[PDB]
Amino acid sequence: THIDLYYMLVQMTDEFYPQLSAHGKQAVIHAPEDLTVSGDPDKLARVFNNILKNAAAYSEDNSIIDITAGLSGDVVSIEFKNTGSIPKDKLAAIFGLGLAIAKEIIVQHGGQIYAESNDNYTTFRVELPAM
Numbered sequence: 001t002h003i004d005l006y007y008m009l010v011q012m013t014d015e016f017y018p019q020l021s022a023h024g025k026q027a028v029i030h031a032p033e034d035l036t037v038s039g040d041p042d043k044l045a046r047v048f049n050n051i052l053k054n055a056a057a058y059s060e061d062n063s064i065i066d067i068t069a070g071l072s073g074d075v076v077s078i079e080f081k082n083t084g085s086i087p088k089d090k091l092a093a094i095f096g097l098g099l100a101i102a103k104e105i106i107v108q109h110g111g112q113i114y115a116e117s118n119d120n121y122t123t124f125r126v127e128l129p130a131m
Contacts, residue, residue, distance in 0.1 A: 002036045002131065003044060005069055005076070012048050013067070016056060024062040027052070031069035037076045037128050039109045044128075048078065050102040051113075051124045055082040057097060058122055071130055080124040086117040 006029065013027045020027055037044070055065050059082040069078040086094070094115050095103050106113050111128040 002038050003041050005035045005037050005078070006031045006033045008041070008045055009048060009067055009069065009078070012045065012052060015049075016052055019056055020065070023059075025056070025059055025065060026063075027065040027067060029067045029069070031067075032071070035069055035071060035076065036131065038131050039128065040105075043105045044109070047102040047105050047113075047126065050097075050099055051080050051126070054086075054094070054097050054099065055080045055122070055124065058082065058084045058086050060084040074130050076128045076130050078126040078128075082122050083120065084122060085119050086115075086122055088117070091115060091117050 009029050009031065013029060016027060052065070059065055063083040066081045067078065068081070069076070095113075099113065099115070103113050106126060106128070109128055111126065114123070114125040116123045
């Protein structure tokens, strides 16, 4: 069993399109269409939906949300980068936008989630074991 990760991210992107276009924002996926990971598909989809919800809420009007997914070594990484900042106290609490469930789902998959924010842009990074 496996997840065709590019088409999972695309279907999520299409669900967020009205929300994003209302503010002139855009999500763009950068990934090998060939990329795959193992895991619970409906659970991983909730992880990515929950992350994009945070990226949408803290992203500036008229900006792009970059979702970069790739394979490097033993790890498949999915990185969400947006323009805009999370308040440092809201960021230090992140683990309707709570990511504690997304984190344990990722933890149960043997992976990790990282969240960073400087005053220009915000990065969410999911790492998962490659097959």
